[PDB]
């Protein structure tokens, strides 16, 4: 039956069951979008200069 | 007053007092100064320092 996807999957994916999933596949990039409210931006004088 | 230099360590042109100016001074003696800007460029929160 040949080696399973634990040993043949590209990008070094780890193959797990229940649920059937792949983990730590080093392919692609995740685009992150942050929305920070204006309250979190403090003044320059408060932080060290 | 003598040997005074003004530095704008922070400025945002907001409606309120969104700017801080630090002046290095070597005065003859302690006292009270009527700090003022004759021009209309800036409005001072403090009329005396």
UniProtKB/Swiss-Prot annotation, chain A:
Superkingdom, taxonomy of origin: Viruses
Disulfide bonds: 13-25
Changes after translation: N-glycosylated.
Bilayer disposition of the protein: Single-pass type I membrane protein
Subcellular location: Virion membrane; Host cell membrane
Its job: Class II viral fusion protein. Fusion activity is inactive as long as E1 is bound to E2 in mature virion. After virus attachment to cell receptor LDLRAD3 and endocytosis, acidification of the endosome induce dissociation of E1/E2 heterodimer and concomitant trimerization of the E1 subunits. This E1 trimer is fusion active, and promotes release of viral nucleocapsid in cytoplasm after endosome and viral membrane fusion. Efficient fusion requires the presence of cholesterol and sphingolipid in the target membrane.
Subunit structure, as described in the record: Interacts with spike glycoprotein E2. The precursor of protein E3/E2 and E1 form a heterodimer shortly after synthesis. Processing of the precursor of protein E3/E2 into E2 and E3 results in a heterodimer of the spike glycoproteins E2 and E1. Spike at virion surface are constituted of three E2-E1 heterodimers. After target cell attachment and endocytosis, E1 change conformation to form homotrimers. Interacts with 6K protein. Interacts (via fusion peptide loop) with host LDLRAD3 (via domain LDL-receptor class A 1); this interaction mediates viral entry to the host cell.
Protein name: Spike glycoprotein E1
Phylogenetic lineage: Viruses, Riboviria, Orthornavirae, Kitrinoviricota, Alsuviricetes
């Amino acid at each position: 039956k040949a080696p399973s996807l634990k040993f043949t999957a590209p990008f070094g994916c780890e193959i797990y069951t229940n649920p059937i999933r792949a983990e730590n596949c080093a392919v692609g990039s995740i685009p992150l979008a942050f929305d920070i409210p204006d309250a979190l931006f403090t003044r320059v004088s408060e932080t060290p200069t | 007053l003598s040997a005074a230099e003004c530095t704008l360590n922070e400025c945002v042109y907001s409606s309120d007092f969104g700017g801080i100016a630090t002046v290095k001074y070597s005065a003859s003696k302690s006292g009270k100064c009527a700090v003022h800007v004759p021009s209309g460029t800036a409005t001072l929160k403090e009329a005396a320092v």
